[PDB]
């Protein structure tokens, strides 16, 4: 395990430039998106929560392709507001239900220091 808690105040500093291997050591799901929502990084914990293969989703668009259930004002709308402002720091619960058993999660989206993080744990 990497020793980082979900929701930590300086999480973007701790995960800064973490490589794909170390990201796979986190206790929580971690996705890194570009400002368009394309997937740059996606860790093992997230693949375990959602069923997706962390190796295959890299390069797909999260909102258009992988996660249409997040293409909504409550998810994508918050993301894009944060991208446009260059300020993003929002934590909310959400249900993932596309081609999967509906799974409720706590989501933390936060601008990265490089890029935007989506951190995920079950609730
Ligand atoms: C809704 O379509 C959500 C899908 C989803 C969320 C998070 C993932 O990492 C993968 C798919």
From Swiss-Prot:
Q: Which domain of life is it from?
A: Bacteria
Entry annotated with the keyword ATP-binding: no
Q: Pfam families per the record?
A: PAS (PF00989)
Query: What keywords is this UniProt entry annotated with?
Result: Chromophore, Photoreceptor protein, Receptor, Sensory transduction
Tell me how the protein is altered or processed after translation: The 4-hydroxycinnamic acid (p-coumaric acid) chromophore is covalently bound via a thioester linkage.
Q: Which GO terms describe its biological process?
A: phototransduction; regulation of DNA-templated transcription
Q: Which GO terms describe its molecular function?
A: identical protein binding; photoreceptor activity
User: Which positions are tagged coiled coil?
Assistant: none
Which intervals hold domain PAS? Answer: 23-86
Q: Could you say which protein family the record assigns here?
A: Belongs to the photoactive yellow protein family.
Q: What is this protein for, i.e. what is its function?
A: Photoactive blue light protein. Probably functions as a photoreceptor for a negative phototaxis response.
Assembly state and interactors? Monomer.
Q: What is this protein called?
A: Photoactive yellow protein
Q: Which organism is it from?
A: Halorhodospira halophila
Q: Which gene encodes it?
A: pyp
């Amino acid at each position: 395990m990497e020793h980082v808690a979900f929701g930590s105040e300086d999480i973007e500093n701790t995960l800064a430039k973490m490589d794909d291997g170390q990201l796979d050591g986190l206790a929580f799901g971690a996705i890194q998106l570009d400002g368009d929502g394309n997937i740059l990084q996606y860790n093992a914990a997230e693949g375990d929560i959602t069923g997706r293969d962390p190796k295959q989703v890299i390069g797909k668009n999260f909102f258009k392709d992988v996660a249409p259930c997040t293409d909504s004002p409550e998810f994508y709308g918050k993301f894009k507001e944060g991208v446009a402002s260059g300020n993003l720091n929002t934590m909310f619960e959400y249900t993932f239900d596309y081609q999967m058993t509906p799974t409720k999660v706590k989501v933390h989206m936060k601008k990265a220091l490089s890029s935007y993080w989506v951190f995920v744990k079950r609730v």
